[PDB]
Amino acid sequence: AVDPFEMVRKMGMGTNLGNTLEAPYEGSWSKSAMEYYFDDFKAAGYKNVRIPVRWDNHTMRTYPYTIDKAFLDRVEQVVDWSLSRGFVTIINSHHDDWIKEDYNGNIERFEKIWEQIAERFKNKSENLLFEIMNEPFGNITDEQIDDMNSRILKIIRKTNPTRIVIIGGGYWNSYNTLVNIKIPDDPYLIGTAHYYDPFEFTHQGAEWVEGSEKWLGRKWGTQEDMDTVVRVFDFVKSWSDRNNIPVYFGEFAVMAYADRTSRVKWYDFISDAALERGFACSVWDNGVFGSLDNDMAIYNRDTRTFDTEILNALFNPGT
Numbered sequence: 494a495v496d497p498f499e500m501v502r503k504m505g506m507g508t509n510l511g512n513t514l515e516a517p518y519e520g521s522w523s524k525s526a527m528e529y530y531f532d533d534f535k536a537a538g539y540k541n542v543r544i545p546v547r548w549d550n551h552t553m554r555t556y557p558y559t560i561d562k563a564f565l566d567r568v569e570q571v572v573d574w575s576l577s578r579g580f581v582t583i584i585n586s587h588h589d590d591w592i593k594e595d596y597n598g599n600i601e602r603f604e605k606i607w608e609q610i611a612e613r614f615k616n617k618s619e620n621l622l623f624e625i626m627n628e629p630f631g632n633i634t635d636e637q638i639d640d641m642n643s644r645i646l647k648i649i650r651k652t653n654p655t656r657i658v659i660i661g662g663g664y665w666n667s668y669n670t671l672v673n674i675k676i677p678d679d680p681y682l683i684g685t686a687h688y689y690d691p692f693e694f695t696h697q698g699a700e701w702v703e704g705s706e707k708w709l710g711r712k713w714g715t716q717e718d719m720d721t722v723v724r725v726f727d728f729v730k731s732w733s734d735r736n737n738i739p740v741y742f743g744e745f746a747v748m749a750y751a752d753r754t755s756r757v758k759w760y761d762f763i764s765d766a767a768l769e770r771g772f773a774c775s776v777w778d779n780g781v782f783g784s785l786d787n788d789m790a791i792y793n794r795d796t797r798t799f800d801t802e803i804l805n806a807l808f809n810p811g812t
Contacts, residue, residue: 494655495619497683501739503620504581504773506764506807507541508534509744511779511789514568515545515587515627523780524794526571533792535578537799538808542580543743543775544571545587545627548606558605565613576618583659583743583775584610585624593629596637600644607645615652623649624659624743628666628687638663639675646677659741661685666743668725672732683773684736686729687744688763690721695759698750700786713755722766730770742767746777749788761806776807 510530516522526544534542551564568584575582586592592603607625614621625645629638642660649658660682662670668686676682689695697708733740745763747756760776767774778791791800 495657497657497681497739498771500581500619500622500657501683501741501771501773503540504741505540506538506768507543507581507773507775508537508539508791509543509545509775509777510571511545511777512781513545514571515547517547517550519567526574527794528574529797530792530794531574531578531580533797533799535580537792537804540581541583541773541775542575543583543585543624544568544575546584547588548586548610549589549591552602552606554602558602560606560609565609569613572614572617572621576620579620581620581622581773583622583624584614585627585659587627589626590631592626593631593633596633596641600641603641604644604648608648611649611652617656619656622657622659622683623653624685626661627743629661629663630665633663635663635670635673642674643677646679646682650679655681657681657683659683659685659743661743665689668729671740672729676736676738683739683741684733685741685743688742688767689745690725691718694751694755695747697748698785699748700784709750710752711755712752714758719762722762726766726770726772729772733770739771739773741773741775743775744777745774746789748785749782749790750785757802757806758811760803761809761811764807765810774807 512523513526519525551561553559572582592599646658662674664670666687671684671686693708694711694713696702697711699705729740747759777789779789780794781787781790791803
């Protein structure tokens with residue numbers, strides 16, 4: 494039982510375990526979870542690991558909506574690796590888009606998932622954090638997002654009275670949305686946004702983004718570019734102060750298609766701006782270097798090395 498604002502301190506700067514467990518089946522995308530990734534992340538200086546989890550294919554689609562024991566075991570094993578090394582560890586539901594596309598029909602099932610997650614991990618260390626829903630988008634409404642956060646939080650608190658829960662809002666956990674959510678009356682909470690602004694810069698040539706090709710060549714680094722990030726982070730910091738709730742940037746990254754000076758600068762400036770204000774961070778890393786199509790990578794899981802230049806920008810002040 495720990496104050497959110499200390500937890501955000503301890504979290505400092507960290508990483509996602511990208512395209513791993515949130516893929517339909519583990520290994521269908523980037524390489525499955527391995528114990529040595531955590532040794533490497535530790536040695537790199539990351540203080541937290543966010544672990545995306547897609548529960549869909551491991552969970553029954555009829556009552557009682559049970560999660561395959563095997564799959565919880567697998568996730569418990571990976572979480573345990575994280576907690577063992579002293580990481581602040583975060584599990585969520587990610588890419589579970591079925592609940593976003595038909596909130597009304599599916600909310601029973603989502604409730605059941607989170608009941609079971611809450612149960613299995615009830616006894617873990619306080620450094621295990623639950624994050625309710627990655628990136629709401631589409632059909633689901635703001636009202637429904639607020640309803641969900643309150644609903645699911647309640648289910649979690651039955652078995653996890655004091656574990657910190659992370660909540661955000663719609664439009665891909667935008668900051669614009671975070672600032673307007675209805676915060677449940679609970680003292681163990683953190684709010685999150687994902688920062689990918691400007692989207693056309695950060696996602697240029699991303700193959701899964703219809704129209705990406707046309708942004709190729711976009712640079713980033715002007716005075717105005719920088720001012721915008723500060724103005725937006727101030728705005729988020731004010732919300733944090735007003736509502737007495739810490740802020741967490743669960744994802745940020747840039748396609749390797751981006752001009753190399755622009756790319757590294759962007760990582761540097763976002764880190765330095767978030768951390769200046771006491772925000773926790775987890776950098777997005779999908780471990781993909783070829784094709785550039787799919788590259789938002791830092792750590793190569795085969796060669797067991799890091800894009801050192803970027804890694805340094807995350808931890809150090811630029812100029």
